[PDB]
Design a protein around this ligand. Structure first.
Ligand SMILES: COc1c(F)c(F)cc(C(=O)O)c1F
Lengths: 257, 300
């Protein structure tokens, strides 16, 4: 059925699965025309296709040429997403094909089901999780490859860097969702937390800084604080009063549709 | 021009003949139905007074043979039978007519309702949907499943409606996924009309037969098939003008005939709202839209 809080461990079992997030496929700037009308200008987008057990990210860059002379772009974007996920599955060897594809948005279900009719044993599922994958374009190296693209391109990343050498997939995913939630809530403050200390850098072959285990605990705490501080600023709530249940409940409540 | 005589009526029963119905008492001297109009299929149907779950009937055409009804106390139902002896049959009918023990098919001269509901329905097409080749008439009941319903169990007692599935390889050409899912013209025109039905008359005949089985038997799978065949047309941008104009007539008479008190079980909100207000054909069904808006505005 739907992927929810009840069935969270299933993300880290040995059945190959992919999350598909389409929220950065069709991206526009809105501007005034010379006549004082409004017009959109598309910018390059991406499909965010992630194996949550391995960290393997299949970033399909959607170049603005895809949209040229097309109508109903927000509708086309879902079908183009399903087309490209379908193409990615067909490109993989049988033993690497997913058993399940979880879409972050329910509007992706019919387009993906129709493109995947040739794969009746691959389950297409929605999720009840509110996942912050829209904030992918706040990861500087992912933003850079998307914006520089002059043509359609697929780029492969490990979104966990080398974390799985030291932590489980469950913990790696929890760290990823906390970082992306913080970047989505207050991007400038999150980047400051990650990047302000110049003695900790990002390896050429990584996306995130080379934090020790103790430095990751500090960073994780600072990200939680950022999310709680922003929830206080949003709702005009004295966060200084809150208890640990209240705080846990607010950060995870944001991970839930 | 003919007559369906009854041996007897040993159990209290509501008898339907087409859109008409009447109550017969246990052991009432009822011996059948006369003055049945030649030129149309007909359906004789039953609902027992002591058990409303017994809801069943027979599609027939008086041009194909001499048919009568006899109660079977073993199987507990009124059975249709064919009499091969023309002289015997004529002699029995004459006796019952002289003793005035038959009800008359109560057709008003001005009233085209039954023609309007069965315009495209042919006995030879019914016999392909309902497979029992040793009889010239077709048994249907409230609980019979469709080939499609059985896929998702006895194949001999099933309604062989044409399978329509919008998320199937049959409905979607590889490479035309968005086009074929958002515009079902390919599926309607090439696969269904040119491919399976051969013409719009056969398509409409099956749509009309599905509606009638839904209405007369409360057959759920028949109701699904009726809505699927409406939705397949309404969801196609490219439909011949003659087919849209005819669909409007077909649906108008179906909506006209539907009992008011059965609208909540026989009409699918999503399909009708989509067909009348969202689909490519939202402006093509003037007569249907007006009767639906005046008779069932709560559904819309
Ligand atoms: C209705 O009475 C009939 C009838 F018309 C008929 F053709 C045959 C029989 C019969 O049992 O053999 C019968 F009882």
């Amino acid at each position: 059925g739907a992927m929810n809080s009840s069935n969270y461990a299933e993300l880290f079992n040995n059945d190959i699965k992919l999350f598909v997030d389409d929220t950065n496929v069709y991206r526009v700037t809105v501007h005034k025309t010379f006549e004082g009308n409004v017009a959109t200008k598309a910018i390059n987008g991406c499909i965010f296709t992630l194996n949550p057990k391995t960290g393997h990210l299949f970033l399909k860059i959607i170049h603005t040429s895809v949209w040229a002379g097309q109508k109903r772009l927000s509708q086309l974007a879902k079908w183009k997403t399903a087309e490209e996920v379908s193409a990615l599955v067909r490109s993989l060897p049988k033993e690497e094909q997913p058993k399940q594809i979880i879409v972050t948005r329910k509007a992706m279900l019919d387009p993906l089901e129709v493109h995947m009719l040739d794969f009746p044993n691959i389950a297409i599922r929605p999720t009840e999780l509110r996942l912050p994958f829209s904030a992918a374009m706040s990861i500087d190296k992912l933003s850079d490859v998307v914006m520089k693209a002059t043509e359609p391109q697929m780029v492969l990343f490990n979104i966990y860097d080398d974390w799985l050498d030291r932590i489980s997939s469950y913990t790696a995913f929890s760290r990823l969702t906390l970082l992306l939630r913080a970047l989505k809530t207050n991007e400038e403050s999150a980047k400051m937390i990650l990047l302000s200390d110049p003695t900790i850098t990002i390896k050429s072959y990584h996306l995130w800084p080379s934090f020790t285990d103790e430095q990751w605990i500090t960073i994780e705490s600072q990200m939680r604080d950022l999310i709680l501080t922003e929830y206080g600023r949003k709702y005009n709530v004295n966060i200084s009063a809150l208890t640990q249940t209240e705080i846990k409940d607010i950060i995870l409540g944001q991970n839930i549709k | 021009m003919n007559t369906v005589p009854f041996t007897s009526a040993p159990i209290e029963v509501t008898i339907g003949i087409d859109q008409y119905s009447f109550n017969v008492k246990e052991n009432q001297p009822f011996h059948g139905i006369k003055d049945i109009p030649i030129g149309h299929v007909h359906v004789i149907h039953f609902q027992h007074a002591d058990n409303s779950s017994m809801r069943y009937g027979y599609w027939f055409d008086c041009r194909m043979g001499n048919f009568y009804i006899q109660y079977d106390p073993k199987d507990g139902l009124y059975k249709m039978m064919e009499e091969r002896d023309g002289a015997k049959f004529e002699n029995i009918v004459h006796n019952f007519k002289e003793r005035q023990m038959m009800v008359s098919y109560p057709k008003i001269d001005e009233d085209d309702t039954w023609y309007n509901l069965t315009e495209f329905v042919q006995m030879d097409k019914i016999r392909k949907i309902v497979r029992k080749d040793e009889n010239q008439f077709s048994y249907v009941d409230s609980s019979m499943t469709t080939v499609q319903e059985n896929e998702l169990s006895d194949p001999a007692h099933s309604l062989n409606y044409t399978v329509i599935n919008f998320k199937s390889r049959e409905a979607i050409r590889p490479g035309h996924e968005m086009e074929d899912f958002l515009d079902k013209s390919y599926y309607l025109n090439t696969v269904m009309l040119q491919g399976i039905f051969k013409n719009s008359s056969n398509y409409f005949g099956e749509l009309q037969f599905a509606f009638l089985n839904a209405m007369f038997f409360g057959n759920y799978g028949s109701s699904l098939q009726w809505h699927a065949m409406i939705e397949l047309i309404c969801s196609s941008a490219t439909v011949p003008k003659h087919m849209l104009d005819k669909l409007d007539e077909i649906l108008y008479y179906q909506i006209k005939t539907l009992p008011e008190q059965y609208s909540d079980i026989l009409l699918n909100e999503r399909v009708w709202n989509i067909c009348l207000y969202s689909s490519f054909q939202k402006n093509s069904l003037h007569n249907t839209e007006k009767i639906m808006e005046n008779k069932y505005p709560e559904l819309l």
